[PDB]
């Protein structure tokens, strides 16, 4: 049910197998690898909802804000632990207007972060590296999600959007033997922190994580994550695949074998066919499955997932008549558009629907994506006009089959033929 539960229970049943390794690439350039096992993070979780349990109380806000590392992940979980509800923000180095938005009781970051944290601030403010972390009822909300609006983000909505997730990477619905989630997806965003983790959390599974400034510096440190004993499966945006299969060198992948990788998500926003297609070439080379990059659409208002293309083979994209469908109607060519071919999901629901009448769109007209589903949020914090608007489409005339509502109006635009989703935008 919770996550903090899904933690407790991994500490019993696999103490001591690593969760959870952090690749520190800014001392060591190879990267140092600090890891620690269920029970070892579990450990810590609780030594920092200890010291949480003393500032407010239940129900109240911690902002978590700290470099990409072990000290966030522990954060984070131990925020939850506490029962409190969690806040995840980078290190501030003018959206000084969150830390206003959610009226937080307690700031946790480390001794690196500190003084730059302070510089924009009366909240607690706890160093986590420098308490005691491995010394020997709850609210349904679990954090905020700060898109600026902060979406609220229960424990039912993370638990259902990890059991869609799961049938978006593995098909047949858990991960085989011997994989683990690679990242370096910055924590403070949606993919970052549901993928990165809570899903390894809740999944039981290693994950091997990493930030995006270390991805920057050398991109060719994603490859090399990416090719090891265990099955790897990642997600990133559209923009690191042209970045990493640019900057990483035919030299950086001397012994470097990728056949192991399990599934790529290529990032829910800005998708192209062509820089994915793009990247399986030019790592073909090195053994790469061209099948294993898959695109993704969802949003934080949503959680993070909502769906994929068929799994089990590389994405189909189809031609449509450029003209036609700025028009509004998606037509076979003869100007042509080449859109990714996603699977209708079963959950969450979705509908195209046109956007003045929220009535819905016949098969082949453009219309915006309405969303349905346990894994939408019920809204965003203090901010009942916004949530309303997004929120609380209904749909008119519902057609058999479809709910009148709640519906989640999306802003993006696509179509739906032949029982396949495209997104225009």
Not at 368 to 389: F, L, T
């Amino acid at each position: 049910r919770s996550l903090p539960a899904a933690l407790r229970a991994c500490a019993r049943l696999q103490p001591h197998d690593p969760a959870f390794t952090f690749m520190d690439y800014e001392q060591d350039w190879d990267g140092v690898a600090i890891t620690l096992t269920w029970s070892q993070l579990y450990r810590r979780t609780l030594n920092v909802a200890q010291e949480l349990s003393r500032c407010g109380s239940t129900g109240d806000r911690v902002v978590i804000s700290a470099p990409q590392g072990l000290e966030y992940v522990v954060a984070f979980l131990g925020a939850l632990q506490a029962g409190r509800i969690a806040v995840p923000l980078s290190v501030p180095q003018r959206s000084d207007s969150v830390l206003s938005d959610s009226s937080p009781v307690a700031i946790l970051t480390t001794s690196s972060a500190v003084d730059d944290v302070v510089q924009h601030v009366p909240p607690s403010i706890i160093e986590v590296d420098l308490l005691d972390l491995d010394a020997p009822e709850y609210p349904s909300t679990a954090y905020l999600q700060y898109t600026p609006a902060g979406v609220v983000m229960s424990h039912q909505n993370v638990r259902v959007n990890f059991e869609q997730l799961m049938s978006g990477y593995f098909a047949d619905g858990i991960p085989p033997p011997n994989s683990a989630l690679v990242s370096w997806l910055p924590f403070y965003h949606d993919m970052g922190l549901v993928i990165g983790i809570c899903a390894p959390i809740l999944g039981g599974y290693p994950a091997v994580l990493t930030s995006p400034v270390s991805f920057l510096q050398r991109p060719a440190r994603w490859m090399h994550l990416m090719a090891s004993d265990f099955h790897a499966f990642s997600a990133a945006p559209n923009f690191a695949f042209e970045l990493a299969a640019r900057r990483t060198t035919d030299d950086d992948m001397a012994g470097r074998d990728l056949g192991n990788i399990l599934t790529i998500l290529s990032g829910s926003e800005r998708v192209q066919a062509a820089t994915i297609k793009r990247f399986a070439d030019r790592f073909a080379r090195f053994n790469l499955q061209e099948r294993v990059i898959r695109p993704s659409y969802g949003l934080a208002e949503a959680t993070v997932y909502v769906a994929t293309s068929k799994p089990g083979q590389p994405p189909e994209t189809v031609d449509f008549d450029t003209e036609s469908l700025s028009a509004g109607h998606a037509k076979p060519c003869a100007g042509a558009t080449s859109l990714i071919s996603y699977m209708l999901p079963r959950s969450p629901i979705v509908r195209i629907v046109d956007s003045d009448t929220c009535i819905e769109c016949p098969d082949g007209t453009v219309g915006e994506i309405w969303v349905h589903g346990d894994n939408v949020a019920n809204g965003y914090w203090q901010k009942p006009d916004e949530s309303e608007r997004t929120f609380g489409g209904k749909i008119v005339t519902p057609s058999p089959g479809t709910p009148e509502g709640p519906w989640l109006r999306t802003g993006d635009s696509g179509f739906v033929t032949d029982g396949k989703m495209f997104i225009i935008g």
